[PDB]
Design a protein around this ligand. Sequence first.
Ligand SMILES: OC[C@H]1O[C@@H](O[C@@H]2[C@@H](O)[C@H](O[C@@H]3[C@@H](O)[C@H](O[C@@H]4[C@@H](O)[C@H](O)O[C@H](CO)[C@H]4O)O[C@H](CO)[C@H]3O)O[C@H](CO)[C@H]2O)[C@H](O)[C@@H](O)[C@@H]1O
Ligand SMILES: OC[C@H]1O[C@@H](O[C@@H]2[C@@H](O)[C@H](O[C@@H]3[C@@H](O)[C@H](O)O[C@H](CO)[C@H]3O)O[C@H](CO)[C@H]2O)[C@H](O)[C@@H](O)[C@@H]1O
Length: 432
Amino acid sequence: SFEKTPAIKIVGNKFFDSESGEQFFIKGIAYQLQETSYIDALADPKICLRDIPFLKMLGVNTLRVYAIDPTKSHDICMEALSAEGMYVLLDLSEPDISINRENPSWDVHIFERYKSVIDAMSSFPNLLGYFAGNEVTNDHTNTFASPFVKAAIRDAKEYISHSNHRKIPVGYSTNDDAMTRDNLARYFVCGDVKADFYGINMYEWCGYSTYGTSGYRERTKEFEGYPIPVFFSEFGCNLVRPRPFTEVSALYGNKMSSVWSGGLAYMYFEEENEYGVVKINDNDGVDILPDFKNLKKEFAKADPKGITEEEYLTAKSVECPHIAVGVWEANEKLPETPDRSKCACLDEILPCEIVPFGKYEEYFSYLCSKVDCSDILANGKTGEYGEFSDCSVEQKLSLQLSKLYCKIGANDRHCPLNDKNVYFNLESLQPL
Ligand SMILES: OC[C@H]1O[C@@H](O[C@@H]2[C@@H](O)[C@H](O[C@@H]3[C@@H](O)[C@H](O[C@@H]4[C@@H](O)[C@H](O)O[C@H](CO)[C@H]4O)O[C@H](CO)[C@H]3O)O[C@H](CO)[C@H]2O)[C@H](O)[C@@H](O)[C@@H]1O
Ligand SMILES: OC[C@H]1O[C@@H](O[C@@H]2[C@@H](O)[C@H](O[C@@H]3[C@@H](O)[C@H](O)O[C@H](CO)[C@H]3O)O[C@H](CO)[C@H]2O)[C@H](O)[C@@H](O)[C@@H]1O
């Protein structure tokens, strides 16, 4: 039974309980432990079942999870969360498969990761939403990554739309860099492709601050009227400890409740970073930390006054920020939808291949000085994306390798790169 967690839907710039029609406010906490590189606590009952009683004590209705393993089952933990009225916001990426902010690509390999997570998690009514990225652009030196994130939002939403699944919204989580934040917010709702919701990692309020002095009043005025639901995807500056979490009183108070859809404290687990509200001891048990009681009391007190779906309904294109060198370099034109079938054709017909099974940079420099690599380049500043720029890194390399091989024209099965990962593709010899 998922009865205690009816699906949440979006209307305008607010979330609503699809059953009751009442506005949904996130009272959340990030929940992520740190042969996958990441640990998927939601795939392991002995972990989630240990923590849910403590999560219940805190009074949260939402978790943010940054990484799941889509090859594992999640029904036990997802059902156990639902039985306690808890929802999940989930990143689609993982640390080893994410859009690289310094050298961005939107390709078949990352898109396949996104689809796998969607197919693993979409059956659960308590899946609140998916993030198609987290703090990808994080300052003025990497704004050209944002078009790739926008393409990911577009493609994730279309993949969901064309699937049998409930239409779980797809949004974005951003940092709070002063020089880029206005542009980022506009960009993710500009043109034809928009985030469904927008989360900000918000650490402006530290210690015993106030609505006016923290910056919260300024942020609230800035996001007034923003066309999609907005919330604090993280909060909980730890400058002053134990964290009193008095920001929670402001966030759910009258002024902010009309703009913000709540937020998620960072975070459940203590990881030698002084951000946890619990610490897992040597016996694998939960040791409650001084912050825990303060977060619990603040959430307990928080009673946001929202508006109902029906009354919101009877109440009611964004220009993309211009480009300026060194300041804002995210083109409105987005990379294409990665095409697994097109790219899979490279695996089959190319004479020279590099297996996935430091290296990449060196080989690109070598090959791209011998052949024209335009067809695999992706430029988020100028909005120029080569025909195979959506293929995997190895496919892109193999293409250039094969071009060089054909340019040489020796036709002797010697691929012109000495490396154990290079091979001649015998299928290339087979006529289609
Ligand atoms: O900056 C250039 C380098 O970028 C490298 O790729 C990164 C990629 O590693 C990153 O993965 C993110 C994680 O960093 C993120 O961690 C969460 C934290 O952001 C948060 O503060 O704490 C939680 C809980 O502890 C962390 O899990 O998790 C998300 C979701 O799984 C991952 O997407 O993403 C960056 C932007 O997409 C990306 O640039 C790249 O590997 C390097 O080569 C490059 O030098
Ligand atoms: O500079 C880039 C950096 O910005 C970080 O966001 C900052 C906030 O950290 C900062 O918060 C200030 C508090 O630390 C201080 O104690 O109080 C003052 C107000 O009196 C706060 O402003 O506020 C600025 C501007 O609002 C933010 O830009 C981001 O978390 C981080 O993502 C980014 O790298």
